[PDB]
Amino acid sequence: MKLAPYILELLTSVNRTNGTADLLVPLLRELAKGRPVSRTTLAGILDWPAERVAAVLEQATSTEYDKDGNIIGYGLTLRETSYVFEIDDRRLYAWCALDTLIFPALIGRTARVSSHCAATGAPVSLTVSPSEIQAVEPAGMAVSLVLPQEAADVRQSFCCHVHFFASVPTAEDWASKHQGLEGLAIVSVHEAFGLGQEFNRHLLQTMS
């Protein structure tokens, strides 16, 4: 499957609001330490005015905060989800399957990723490094993709439809019952990883 439409709409979703791409990688690296991240901490890391950080974050409507207004989730999160993203001894989480494949290159770490098949509840796991995936269990693991939508909550529009599956046939069965999803497509986790690599490549270009 040619994945250019997915890559294209994901980059567009990140390059839509100026600065977002430039705040993403530093914030992911900081969240990776496993503690909440203050806006003030972030502003210093980026060397931005606070108002610039705030404007970008306000545009990112799915961003997760704790009781202190600290950032605790943006793709990578401290708040439990179905996608477990373990770096070092530290259990973090991701908003969706494709997140888990993308972040390790962006944060320069190897993650032990685990979840369950969205069609059958079967456990799935794999090791994701900046350059490759290993220990893919089961070997035929698949991922669902949908097309990001322009004026749409990213987590509700994209992330919550982007799952792991035990296999491509299992995933395709599931897919046939959900054709109402825009640009719904099933790919192998290898193809999804490749998609993530093209996204990351392009992202690092658009940064300043």
**Token pair recorded at residue 54:** 């705030």
How far is 33 from 108, CA to CA, in rounded Å?
12
How far is 68 from 47, CA to CA, in rounded Å?
22
User: Of 98, 87, 105, which Cα lies nearest the Cα of 141?
Assistant: 98
CB atoms within 10 A of CB 108: 11
Number of helical H runs and strand E runs in the chain: 8, 11
Given resolution (angstroms): 1.8
Find the helix packing angle between 97-107 and 20-32, rounded to 10°. 90
First to last CA, the chain: 31
**Token pair recorded at residue 57:** 């974050």
Catalytic residue list contains 96: yes
**Token pair recorded at residue 86:** 């373990």
How far is 97 from 190, CA to CA, in rounded Å?
12
Which amino acid does the sequence have at 176?
A: S
Catalytic residue list contains 117: no
Query: Annotated catalytic residue: which of 47, 96, 117, 153?
Result: 96
Distances in Å between the Cα of 176 and the Cα atoms of 124, 144, 157, 181 are 21, 12, 19, 10
- Structurally, what CATH architecture does the domain formed by 1-208 represent? 2-Layer Sandwich (3.30)
**Residues 208/16, Cβ–Cβ less than 8 Å:** no
Strand-pair partners of 128: 111, 133
Exposure of 177 in the CB half-sphere (CA atoms within 13 A)? 6
Long-range pairs of 5-8 with CB within 8 A, sequence gap ≥ 24: 5/147, 5/183, 6/145, 6/147, 6/148, 6/183, 6/185, 6/195, 7/195, 7/198, 7/199, 7/202
Cβ-based neighbours of 126, under 8 Å, separated by 6 or more: 113, 133, 134, 135, 136, 137, 141, 189
- Strand order of the β-sheet with 64-65 is 64-65, 71-74, 76-77, 90-94, 83-87, 111-116, 123-128, 133-137
Query: Annotated catalytic residue: which of 99, 117, 153, 160?
Result: 99
Tell how far CA 142 is from the center of its chain: 16
Query: Annotated catalytic residue: which of 22, 47, 68, 159?
Result: 159
How far is 117 from 20, CA to CA, in rounded Å?
31
Q: Report the DSSP pairing between strands 71-74 and 133-137.
A: unpaired
Cβ-based neighbours of 70, under 8 Å, separated by 6 or more: 36, 37, 38, 39
How far is 197 from 203, CA to CA, in rounded Å?
10
**What are the residue ranges spanned by the domains of the chain?**
1-208
Distances in Å between the Cα of 128 and the Cα atoms of 25, 105, 136, 189 are 17, 9, 9, 11
**Residues 30/78, Cβ–Cβ less than 8 Å:** no
Alpha helices in the chain (DSSP H): 4-15, 20-32, 39-46, 50-59, 97-107, 154-157, 168-176, 189-206
**Token pair recorded at residue 162:** 């982007």
**Residues 10/198, Cβ–Cβ less than 8 Å:** no
Catalytic residue list contains 99: yes
